[PDB]
Curated annotation (Swiss-Prot), chain A:
Thrombin cleaves factor C9 to produce C9a and C9b. This is Complement component C9. Pore-forming component of the membrane attack complex (MAC), a multiprotein complex activated by the complement cascade, which inserts into a target cell membrane and forms a pore, leading to target cell membrane rupture and cell lysis. The MAC is initiated by proteolytic cleavage of C5 into complement C5b in response to the classical, alternative, lectin and GZMK complement pathways. The complement pathways consist in a cascade of proteins that leads to phagocytosis and breakdown of pathogens and signaling that strengthens the adaptive immune system. Belongs to the complement C6/C7/C8/C9 family. It comes from the Eukaryota. Plasma (at protein level). It is found in: Secreted; Target cell membrane. The chain holds residues 218 to 315 of 559 of the full protein. Homooligomer; about 20 C9 chains oligomerize to give rise to a huge beta-barrel that forms a 100 Angstrom diameter pore in target membranes. Component of the membrane attack complex (MAC), composed of complement C5b, C6, C7, C8A, C8B, C8G and multiple copies of the pore-forming subunit C9.
From Swiss-Prot, chain B:
SUPFAM superfamilies: LDL receptor-like module (SSF57424), TSP-1 type 1 repeat (SSF82895). Residues 401-431 form the EGF-like domain. Component of the membrane attack complex (MAC), a multiprotein complex activated by the complement cascade, which inserts into a target cell membrane and forms a pore, leading to target cell membrane rupture and cell lysis. The MAC is initiated by proteolytic cleavage of C5 into complement C5b in response to the classical, alternative, lectin and GZMK complement pathways. The complement pathways consist in a cascade of proteins that leads to phagocytosis and breakdown of pathogens and signaling that strengthens the adaptive immune system. Disulfide bonds join 8-43, 19-53, 22-59, 65-76, 70-89, 83-98, 105-143, 399-446, 401-417, 404-419, 421-430, 453-486. The modification Phosphothreonine is found at residue 314. Residues 464-487 are annotated as: Disordered. This is Complement component C8 beta chain. The gene is C8B. One of its GO terms (cellular component) is extracellular exosome. One of its GO terms (biological process) is killing of cells of another organism.
Curated annotation (Swiss-Prot), chain C:
C-, N- and O-glycosylated. O-glycosylated with core 1 or possibly core 8 glycans. The chain holds residues 313 to 409 of 843 of the full protein. It comes from Homo sapiens (Human). This is Complement component C7. Component of the membrane attack complex (MAC), a multiprotein complex activated by the complement cascade, which inserts into a target cell membrane and forms a pore, leading to target cell membrane rupture and cell lysis. The MAC is initiated by proteolytic cleavage of C5 into complement C5b in response to the classical, alternative, lectin and GZMK complement pathways. The complement pathways consist in a cascade of proteins that leads to phagocytosis and breakdown of pathogens and signaling that strengthens the adaptive immune system. C7 serves as a membrane anchor. It is found in: Secreted; Target cell membrane. It is linked to Complement component 7 deficiency: A rare defect of the complement classical pathway associated with susceptibility to severe recurrent infections, predominantly by Neisseria gonorrhoeae or Neisseria meningitidis.
Curated annotation (Swiss-Prot), chain E:
Residues 64-100 form the LDL-receptor class A domain. This is Complement component C8 alpha chain. The gene is C8A. PROSITE patterns: EGF_1, LDLRA_1, LDLRA_2, MACPF_1, MACPF_2, TSP1. The keyword Glycoprotein applies.
Length: 40, 487, 88, 393, 482
């Protein structure tokens, strides 16, 4: 949150910011395919 | 750390013995002259050198096996033990080619717990079982029914009695000391006239507090008693075979290896137990100072004011627990930092029945095993072994080891001295601690070997070892000088 | 079965205090003087010992270590543990 | 800015390999692609068929007096006729009729899955425990009964494993560190936790290895002539290394970090950042995927969740760490040109060390540093710098 | 923090080949581990040791190499005659039971039978291939009582809750002289706390004013907790050793002439050391240390006013369980309690670890074998080890930040840091005021020598310790027989 205010005329302002990140990984398994004598 | 490590030294070699008539080898040895310590490099070399021979002196090594030769182990067994349905040779040899087998034990029968552990000789100086000397799997017929609780047991032929002898001690102490002090001193002075005035103040506090709590609780539980027979013993074959490999000539190195492999003394009477020692030791201190002063003058005017306030609090606490018999689930929960709830204590003692340590033990020198019914030229092997045993005690006794810091204890396993560190100090020499000082317990240097015959003397000193540096404990456990007849 | 159990405890505390006040004045130009002093000193000490020493002969190995585990709250013995020792 | 894939030309054709009936050359990657320019894929080795220019040698490669199994793998008659099926293709019924029973005379015993996966291959790309070069279903006709691990039940240990010692360890390492300052005010936090459980360690035998029928025959298939593509194809399908020993277990790790500040005319500012992560490996799904979540939140854990999670590692471990051995040490001598295969596996691994070098990619902007991924050099950065090259904020 | 010193790995140029030894059927050569990588830089494609097939200059020697008794032709072991047809498998070929009544296999091998038979590596702390034969019995039926056997079972058919007959006995391997089964534990605990505060003022006024104030508050906690438990202890034999068959053949395969490669390979495969004795245990250590501090000061005069506060908290916490079940060592890792200790202890019944042990350098094994003296080989094996403990040594693995362990993984070093990623600059959370020791730089090679002088040298570390950090056990020079 950010605020700026002044007088001489009256001036006021505000800013507000949010950021979120979440992830979750549930790994089951992994593989590699035979690069010779492959059956198609 | 204030160190420069000590690397091992063995001596320059002995001369060779002449060739042994019966072992057909010759031997050379060195004394251990300085042990490895502060992680200085080992030089162990297994403490010996040996060579083959070409001499032709007569030998009488054929002491007759009267019964049956155990083909692999070189044991002899009396003829009533062949085909008894039991392994009397070690390698099952005695039960070969049995035209019938006769059983004796009518029921299953446990070995008494640790009875094979008691079968091994001790190095009395490290206080350690080294290796196997009497065959606690030998039953000579036997099969007499023995009971503990409702469990039934088989007694090794070597053992006179294993019996519960079921005794227990608890000893407890708790101590508190406390002391308190508080002092307050003040001054005030004033003057005025109509113009001038003056004022002065001091207030003070000094304060102190101290406490100790000390608690010790020890239990000794003694729920078996072992006594070995005096003689007519049946040896473990691995011991018997190094004994048949000893020279009749004297050269200390081959005899030294028997004490390394099989211990210096055999265990003849022992009480078998659990111990549960607990100690909790606490020292606590607090202090304060407060001080406050003012001065004033008036005429125009001036003020001065000061405060100085201070506090300290500390605890040092140590706890040690040692437990020496039982089963690992109980043993860990007893070993926990909290004073054991009596259920734990119950289940621990119940398991001490099934796995004891030795509490107190009376031991005999191993040469009383060496016997004319078991070895050729036995009496020479005895006299040799007696001399070697005395020379070995001079090697294994800890006295060579340079003193530990922090009141650490040396035990000199193998050919290295390692300082066991108490609670509250750490590192190779036990130097590293937060604490200011520690009381030191005394031990001598190695004793001077002998003076001349016609009245003979041995002498000891404590020059580095002594208690007075940093206000230590007891200096002594025996005689600061020693003398005897030559014969 | 045997017990010895002994508890012994002591306290002292002390306070001492001393003071003075003095005053003088003159007039015809007015003028006065005052002096005041105070001291307080206090000392206190405590001590406690407990020793307790249950000893047992006969009993099952666990029941022995059960009964002989000293209770600060019951120095003679917990009645059920004691009865269990007396069984074992 | 973004950069596309770049490669060498295609090297000049090999001559025709007599027994393999093929011919190839290769193409080095120069740049994999960078900063989301067009990412590389295209082949480093590719090949054409040939009717060979000279005769192939005699095809048999039998180790002398050894028994020629249907695999074509070197074995001795004790391994077949004792019914154990060591030679790699379950042939024992062909070999003996009388008393061919397994080496455990009466006391037949279960295998172990934790033993079978011993000697995983490993590759510097992805660091994957590739399925075993070793044939841990060869037992050398041994009965070889362990009773180790927490199931309190006997198992036969495989020939290529010197021991699978279940030398248990459980360790938690924990640190926290916090600070405060004021004149304005500042507040700072760091937290680290890891927990490791080692169920056991396997060591692979350093002589007399039995390899899978596929591993040995898939080196028979090599070029014999130093051609990258076929050597790389053996690497990328069996490893750059094998795990010559390693530690089976489970692991968790956590972090929390916070960093916080606060500071006519009216001026003020506030600044804050947050970072939290959780990792879990090993154990069965229900307990692991409970706990990895559960520990990211503040929750004061039931010790029984730790007991259940780490108990399940007995049934489902992960490799925590291991001793890498360069893979070519598994071409058994008493095979035709065995050493020339070793030599050029090592030269192909040296060629592996040449092109996958990240160092030649271009500099990331601002406070960043470069990483390599499958077809991209890229970066990620402090101080709120943004984009795949960190050029902006 | 200091910049990294990452470098690509180097092996040496190759040595010339050894000649084609009969029976071995092999040429060998080596590279000298010239410089395995510092903590960063890409690994060597190559390796230290090589074998290649070759036909021999003469015909292979017969099993008369064993002398007057049997040898299993397809493997190493020379056997005493009684082992042929004893009813038990004495060699890897099994021919000692071919073409022909021990029941002692009724009892499982003693817990630790493996890890005590395996060699050991003082340069990496790893095990190695079997040195002793973990399963050799020599025909002995030597049983050992299990002092931990006691475990509960319940029987629904007869209403007994009672302790099971399982695990009561183990068969001892012939290579263990004794293995004892006595129950012990020992725990040592410290707590120390220190706590301090100071508060001070002064003021002057005249008719000017000045006022000053200072505050400090501090706390320390240390504790160490150590436990050891033992279920048994053991000592290996020092005469008539039966080697592992793998060791035995890998030894016979060594050259009578001194060439470094084959002896370095046997060192690397069978280990720098062999375990002479050990203890089988569970150790739990726990260590917990805390510092805190808080300070303030004020100053006022006329006027203007200023104030500041600074405060710290830091905690180091370790929990480590060796031995026990995977489950309960997770329990006792995560939490210290009367819960986690008791079940951990129950799991030490089943899964112990070797907690502490004593050892000898590998060449001493040979003299204690049934093979008779091998003095030429034994000296070559020593002569190679006397280079090896310089060449393969973790001393070369260089700077580790934040007290990290330097270890050589085969041909490549790691610095296992206790926080952060490995290698240089392991910290970014800790300040540059952090405390870490100085620890050894390596041995030199054996220096140039004179009739009464030869030297080998060390440095306590290359840099000074980080801030108030500790230092090495203290050496600069060691000496040799020239
Ligand atoms: C000097 O005078 C001050 C009087 O206030 C005494 O200080 C107090 O003493 C009483 C009685 O012991 C305590 O209950 C108060 O807490 C004290 N106040 C403080 C914080 O100073 C002090 O005793 C005097 N010194 C003497 C006795 O000479
Ligand atoms: C504070 O905020 C007010 C809001 O109107 C503004 O008028 C003033 O100029 C700012 N400065 C002050 C009052 O400190
Ligand atoms: C273990 O958990 C208990 C019960 O919640 C708690 O009292 C204790 O402080 C914990 N101990 C440790 C070491 O976390
Ligand atoms: C015996 O011991 C000395 C001391 O090292 C050596 O010079 C030599 O081995 C001698 O024979
Ligand atoms: C030297 O002599 C005696 C032998 O009676 C030793 O026991 C002791 O060490 C003394 O100093
Ligand atoms: C030869 O190599 C070029 C690369 O310069 C390819 O474009 C072409 O297809 C052929 O393989
Ligand atoms: C071993 O190393 C040399 C350099 O010493 C190379 O020419 C070649 O790799 C040889 O095999
Ligand atoms: C330095 O340290 C090792 C370990 O003791 C020695 O064996 C060797 O001399 C090395 O140079
Ligand atoms: C230095 O590193 C440690 C600390 O002394 C030791 O284990 C070793 O002696 C080495 O030289
Ligand atoms: Ca018999
Ligand atoms: Ca046999």
């Amino acid at each position: 949150e950010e605020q700026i205010e002044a007088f001489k005329l009256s001036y006021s302002s505000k800013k507000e910011k949010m950021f979120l990140h979440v992830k979750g990984e549930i790994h089951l398994g992994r593989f590699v395919m035979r690069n010779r004598d492959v059956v198609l | 750390v204030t160190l420069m490590p000590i690397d091992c030294e063995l001596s320059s070699w002995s001369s060779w013995t002449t060739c042994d008539p019966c072992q057909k080898k010759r031997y050379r040895y060195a004394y251990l002259l300085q042990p490895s310590q502060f992680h200085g490099e080992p030089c162990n070399f297994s403490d010996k050198e040996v060579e083959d021979c070409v001499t032709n002196r007569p030998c009488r090594s054929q002491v007759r096996c009267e019964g049956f030769v155990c083909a692999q182990t070189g044991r002899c067994v009396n003829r009533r033990l062949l085909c008894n349905g039991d392994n009397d040779c070690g390698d099952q040899s005695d039960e070969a080619n049995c035209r019938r087998i006769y059983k004796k034990c009518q029921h299953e029968m446990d070995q008494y717990w640790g009875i094979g552990s008691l079968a091994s000789g001790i190095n009395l100086f490290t206080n350690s079982f080294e290796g196997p000397v009497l065959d606690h799997r030998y039953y000579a017929g036997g099969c007499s029914p023995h009971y503990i609780l409702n469990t039934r047991f088989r007694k090794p032929y070597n053992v006179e009695s294993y019996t519960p002898q079921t005794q227990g001690k608890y000893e407890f102490i708790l101590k508190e000391y406390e002391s308190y002090s508080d002092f307050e001193r003040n001054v005030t002075e004033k003057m005025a006239s109509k113009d001038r005035g003056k004022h002065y103040i001091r207030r003070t506090k000094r304060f102190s507090h101290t406490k100790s709590v000390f608690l010790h609780a020890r239990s000794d539980l003694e729920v078996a008693h072992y006594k070995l027979k005096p003689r007519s013993l049946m040896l473990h074959y691995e011991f018997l075979q190094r004994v048949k490999r000893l020279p009749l000539e004297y050269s200390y190195g081959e005899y030294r290896d028997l004490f390394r492999d099989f211990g210096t003394h055999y265990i003849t009477e022992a009480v078998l137990g659990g111990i549960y020692e607990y100690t909790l030791v606490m020292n606590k201190e607090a202090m304060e100072r407060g001080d406050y002063t003012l001065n004033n003058v008036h005429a125009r005017g001036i003020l001065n004011e000061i405060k100085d306030r201070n506090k300290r609090d500390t605890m040092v606490e140590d706890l040690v627990v040692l437990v020496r018999g039982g089963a690992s689930e109980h043993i860990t929960t007893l070993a926990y930092q909290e004073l054991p709830t009596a259920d734990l204590m119950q289940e621990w003692g119940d398991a001490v029945q099934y796995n004891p340590a030795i509490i107190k033990v009376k031991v005999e020198p191993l040469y009383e095993l060496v016997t004319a019914t078991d070895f050729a030229y036995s009496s020479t092997v005895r006299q040799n072994m007696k001399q070697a045993l005395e020379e070995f005690q001079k090697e294994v006794s800890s006295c060579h080891c340079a003193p530990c810091q922090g009141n650490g204890v040396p035990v000199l396993k193998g050919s290295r001295c390692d300082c066991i560190c108490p609670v509250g100090s750490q590192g190779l020499a036990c130097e590293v601690s937060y604490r200011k000082n520690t009381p030191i317990d005394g031990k001598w240097n190695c004793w001077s070997n002998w003076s001349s015959c016609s009245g003979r003397r041995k002498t000891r000193q404590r020059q580095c070892n002594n208690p007075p540096p940093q206000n230590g404990g007891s200096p002594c456990s025996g005689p600061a000088s020693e003398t005897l007849d030559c014969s | 079965y045997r017990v010895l159990f002994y508890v012994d405890s002591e306290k002292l505390k002390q306070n001492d205090f001393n003071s003075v006040e003095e005053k003088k004045c003159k007039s015809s130009s007015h003028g006065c003087k005052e002096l005041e002093n105070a001291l307080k000193a206090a000392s206190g000490t405590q001590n406690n010992v407990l020793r307790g020493e249950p000893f047992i002969r006969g009993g099952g190995a666990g029941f022995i270590s059960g009964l002989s585990y000293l209770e600060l709250d019951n120095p003679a013995g917990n009645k059920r543990r004691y009865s269990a020792w007396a069984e074992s | 800015s973004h950069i596309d894939c770049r490669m060498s030309p295609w090297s000049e054709w090999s001559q025709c390999d007599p027994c393999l009936r093929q011919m190839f050359r290769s193409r080095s990657i120069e740049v994999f692609g960078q900063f989301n320019g067009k990412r590389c894929t295209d082949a480093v080795g590719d090949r054409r068929q040939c009717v060979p220019t000279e005769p192939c040698e005699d095809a048999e490669d039998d180790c002398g007096n050894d028994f020629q199994c249907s695999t074509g793998r070197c074995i001795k008659m004790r391994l077949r006729c004792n019914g154990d099926n060591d030679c790699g293709d379950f042939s024992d019924e062909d070999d003996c009729e009388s008393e061919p029973r397994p080496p455990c005379r009466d006391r037949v015993v279960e295998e172990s899955e934790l033993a079978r996966t011993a000697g995983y291959g490993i590759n510097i790309l992805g660091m994957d425990p590739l399925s075993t070069p070793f044939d841990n279903e060869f037992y050398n006709g041994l009965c070889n009964r362990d009773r180790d691990g927490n199931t309190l039940t006997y198992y036969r240990r495989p020939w290529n494993v010197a021991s699978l010692i279940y030398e248990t360890k459980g360790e938690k390492n924990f640190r926290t560190e916090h600070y405060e300052e004021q004149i304005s005010k500042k507040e700072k936090m760091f937290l680290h936790v890891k927990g490791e459980i080692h169920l056991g360690r396997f060591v692979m035998r350093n002589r007399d290895v039995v390899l899978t029928t596929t591993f040995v025959d898939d080196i028979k298939a090599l070029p014999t002539t130093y051609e990258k593509g076929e050597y790389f194809a053996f690497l990328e399908t069996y490893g750059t290394h094998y795990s010559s020993s390693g530690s089976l277990g489970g692991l968790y790790e956590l972090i929390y970090v916070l960093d916080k500040a606060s500071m006519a005319v009216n001026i003020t500012s506030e600044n804050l950042i947050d970072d939290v992560v959780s990792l879990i490996r090993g154990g069965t799904r229900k307990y692991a995927f409970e706990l990895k979540e559960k520990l990211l939140r503040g929750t004061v854990i039931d010790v029984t969740d730790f007991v259940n999670w780490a108990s399940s590692i007995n049934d489902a471990p992960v490799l925590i760490s291991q001793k890498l051995s360069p893979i070519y040490n598994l071409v058994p001598v008493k095979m035709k040109n065995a050493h020339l295969k070793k030599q050029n596996l090592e030269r192909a691994i040296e060629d592996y060390i040449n092109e996958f070098s990240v160092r030649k990619c271009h500099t990331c902007q601002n406070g960043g540093t470069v990483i390599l991924m499958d077809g991209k050099c890229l970066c990620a950065c402090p101080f709120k710098f943004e984009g795949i090259a960190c050029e902006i904020s | 923090a200091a910049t990294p010193a990452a470098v690509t790995c180097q092996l040496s140029n190759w040595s010339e080949w050894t000649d084609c030894f009969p029976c071995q059927d092999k040429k060998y050569r080596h590279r000298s581990l010239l410089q395995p990588n510092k903590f960063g830089g890409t690994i060597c494609s190559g390796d230290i040791w090589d074998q290649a097939s070759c036909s021999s200059s003469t015909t292979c020697v017969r099993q008369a190499q064993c002398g007057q008794d049997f040898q299993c032709k397809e493997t190493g072991r020379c056997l005493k005659r009684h082992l042929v047809c004893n009813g038990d498998q004495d060699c890897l070929d099994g021919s000692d039971e071919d073409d022909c009544d021990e029941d002692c296999s009724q009892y499982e091998p003693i817990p630790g039978s493996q890890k005590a038979a395996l060699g050991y590596n003082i340069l990496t702390q790893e095990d190695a291939q079997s040195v002793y034969d973990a399963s050799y019995y020599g025909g002995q039926c030597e049983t050992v009582y299990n002092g931990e056997w006691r475990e509960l079972r319940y029987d629904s058919t007869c209403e007994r809750l009672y302790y099971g007959d399982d695990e009561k006995y183990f068969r001892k391997p012939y290579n263990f002289l004794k293995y004892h089964f006595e129950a012990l534990a020992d725990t040592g605990i410290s707590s120390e706390f220190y706590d301090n505060a100071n508060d001070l003022l002064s003021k002057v006024k005249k008719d000017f004013l000045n006022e000053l104030n200072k505050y400090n508050e501090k706390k320390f906690i240390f504790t160490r907790i150590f436990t050891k438990v033992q279920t048994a202890h053991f000592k290996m034999r020092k005469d008539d050793i039966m080697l592992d068959e793998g060791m035995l053949q890998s030894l016979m395969e060594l050259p009578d002439q001194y060439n470094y490669g084959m002896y370095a390979k046997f060192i690397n495969d069978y280990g720098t050391h062999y375990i002479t004795s050990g203890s089988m245990g569970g150790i739990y250590e726990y260590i917990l240390v805390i510092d805190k501090a808080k300070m303030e000061s004020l100053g006022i005069t006329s006027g203007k006013t200023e104030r500041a506060r600074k405060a710290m908290a830091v905690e180091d916490i370790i929990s480590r369980v060796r031995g026990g079940s995977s489950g309960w060592s997770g329990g006792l890792a995560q939490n210290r309690s009367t819960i986690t200790y008791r079940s951990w202890g129950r799991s030490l019944k089943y899964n112990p670890v070797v907690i502490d042990f004593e050892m000898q350098p590998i060449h001493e094994v040979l003299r204690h074998t049934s093979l008779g003296p091998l003095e030429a080989k034994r000296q070559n094996l020593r002569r190679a080890l006397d280079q090896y403990l310089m060449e393969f040594n973790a001393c070369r693995c260089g700077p580790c930040f934040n007290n990290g362990v330097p270890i050589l993984e085969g041909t490549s070093c790691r610095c296992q840091c206790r926080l952060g990623s490995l290698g240089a600059a392991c910290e970014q959370t800790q300040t540059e005021g952090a405390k870490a020791d100085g620890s050894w730089s390596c041995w030199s090679s054996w220096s140039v020598c004179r009739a009464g002088i030869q030297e080998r040298r060390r440095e306590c570390d290359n840099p000074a310790p980080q801030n108030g950090g500790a230092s090495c056990p203290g050496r600069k020079v060691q000496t040799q027989a020239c």
